[PDB]
């Protein structure tokens, strides 16, 4: 009920004598929490693929097994306004939080009306024989307009597409053949004709063509989700750096609690953390700043209640040992702790209740009783 009551249910008595009695231990509780983590997103095969001259062809779509990188898909969003950002299987808002096993970049340039044809479960003339997606394709298709880099005048005939396949196309199958194919009952081996033609046709990329015939660059990232150790995880997050406050820090993996301050220490260009004589972490480097921080133990201390005796009165005072009166009525800082509940008199008397380091308290009549 009171500090005197706290002394009552501690000494197992209802008549507390005159003196000082330690009851509890004041400990500052950590309010916030820092998850500042080093080893963050870095160079990755993600770039250099979305910005180039020519990616690949329709029948000659390339492949890049991106691995050994901290997959951070945030760079993909900060780009030119796309034409189609559809994701099949994977939620677009959790790309930076899912550990993927492998990702294969397959880029190809098609016309305008061919953007909606390339999709898992949709057939046609370009998504049926050139590049077909399976029924369990867990990836994202990214398309955008490219009417400035692949729009050469008079018709850019560099892009070809395969047609008239002997059989259906299989998921992720490469078709780079150029043999002469015929409809039937017509001998055609190396020469062309009316019913015989090469299995490749040029693409008309001219500014005179309206919507549906412009070149559009499409790249599909096949995110393979398995149970094996993943190689491309999401980027780890890191909060701000708040100092002069006992919080929970996670610098470089050594999670701990305490007040983060700034010291005058000069670490070596290779040593990151450091201990003291008692082998306890006392100073660490900033992960993303290499700043010499100084971690100090969270403010604690013992609580002592000064009771002049229940028979005399009931007014008591508390003494927070080892407290600068900052970590939580008269308040006076002493050499032993923060004394809350009494005022410092400039007089001098006999030591009735020993407080510490010369300080002494007593129940004396002021003019009042305190």
């Amino acid at each position, epitope marked *: 009920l009171d500090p005197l009551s706290e002394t009552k249910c501690t000494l197992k008595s209802f008549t507390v004598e005159k003196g000082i009695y330690q009851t509890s231990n004041f400990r500052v509780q950590p309010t916030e929490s820092i998850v500042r983590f080093p080893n963050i997103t870095n160079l990755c095969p993600f770039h250099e693929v979305f910005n180039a001259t020519t990616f690949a062809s329709v029948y000659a779509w390339n492949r890049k097994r991106i691995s050994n990188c901290v997959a951070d898909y945030s760079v993909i969003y900060n780009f030119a306004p796309f034409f189609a*950002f559809k*994701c099949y299987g994977v939620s677009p808002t959790k790309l930076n939080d899912l550990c993927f096993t492998n990702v294969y970049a397959d880029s190809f340039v098609i016309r305008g009306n061919e953007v909606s044809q390339i999709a898992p479960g949709q057939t046609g003339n370009i998504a049926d024989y050139n590049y077909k997606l399976p*029924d369990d394709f867990t990836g994202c298709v990214i398309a955008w307009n490219s009417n400035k880099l692949d729009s050469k005048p008079s018709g850019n005939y560099n892009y070809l597409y395969r047609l008239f396949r002997k059989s259906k196309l299989k998921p992720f199958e490469r078709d780079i053949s150029t043999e002469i194919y015929q409809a039937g009952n017509k001998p055609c081996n190396g020469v062309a004709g009316s019913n015989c033609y090469s299995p490749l046709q040029s693409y008309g990329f001219r500014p005179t063509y309206g919507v549906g015939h412009q070149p559009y660059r499409v790249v599909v990232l096949s995110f393979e989700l398995l149970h094996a150790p993943a190689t491309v995880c999401g980027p780890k997050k890191s909060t701000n750096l708040v100092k002069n406050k006992c919080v929970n820090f996670n610098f470089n993996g050594l999670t701990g609690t305490g007040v983060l301050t700034e010291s005058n220490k000069k670490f070596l260009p290779f040593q990151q953390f450091g201990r003291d004589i008692a082998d306890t972490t006392d100073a660490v480097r900033d992960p993303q700043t290499l700043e010499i921080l100084d971690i100090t133990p969270c403010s604690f201390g013992g609580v002592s209640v000064i009771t002049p005796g229940t028979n005399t009165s009931n007014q008591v005072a508390v003494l927070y040992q080892g407290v600068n009166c900052t970590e939580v009525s008269n308040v006076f800082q002493t050499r032993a702790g923060c004394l809350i509940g009494a005022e410092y008199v400039n007089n001098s008397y006999e030591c009735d209740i020993p407080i510490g380091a010369g300080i002494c308290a007593s129940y004396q009549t002021q003019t009042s009783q305190s």
Partner: antibody
Amino acid sequence: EVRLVESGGGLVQPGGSLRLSCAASGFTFRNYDIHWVRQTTGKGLEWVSAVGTSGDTYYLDSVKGRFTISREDAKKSVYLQMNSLRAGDTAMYYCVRGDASPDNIYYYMDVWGTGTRVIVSS
Amino acid sequence: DIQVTQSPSPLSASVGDRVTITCRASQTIGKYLNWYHQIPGKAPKLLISAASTLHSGVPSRFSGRGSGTDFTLTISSLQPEDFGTYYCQQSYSSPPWTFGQGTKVEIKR
């Protein structure tokens, strides 16, 4: 406990531009995706057009251009600013919070809101 | 795209029956579907997540099934506080998640 106030209001005329809001309280605002579902009287859910944490911004092919999303973690609330609307956008707007498994992509959008009504007439 | 053909609008039912609300997709979306419940005069609520796991707060015998395109909401027991429209969310459709048309359940008399 977990409520999303949508006290934005709307009384603009066809050809104006209003500004709504969707403030949440009861969970982590930064570690959550905020959507914006439309419920027309006599129809179903139209679209979402949500926003992401790392600058992820998505739109619908039939609504892009006349809308823009802006996430502000300062006051723990989002806003929806739109350009001149047509005579087909007079419906009741919501904002749902899309969540999935901690290591999956099974979105379910459990945390809904309250609902803001928008009308454009004289 | 990937559309959903839900049950027809008039679906009569009473207190205690086996109601089957089928949400059939045009493609193979696997097991990516979510059931909702929008009562007249209140924001919708979630009932079934991932088409097979009950998220929370739905103990009124709301079991779900589905394999490929076979989803159906088999309600073995109905309650007077579980009436309204239901919507199916095709998660394996597109980033603009398109919901269903709505299936309302009335009372028989």
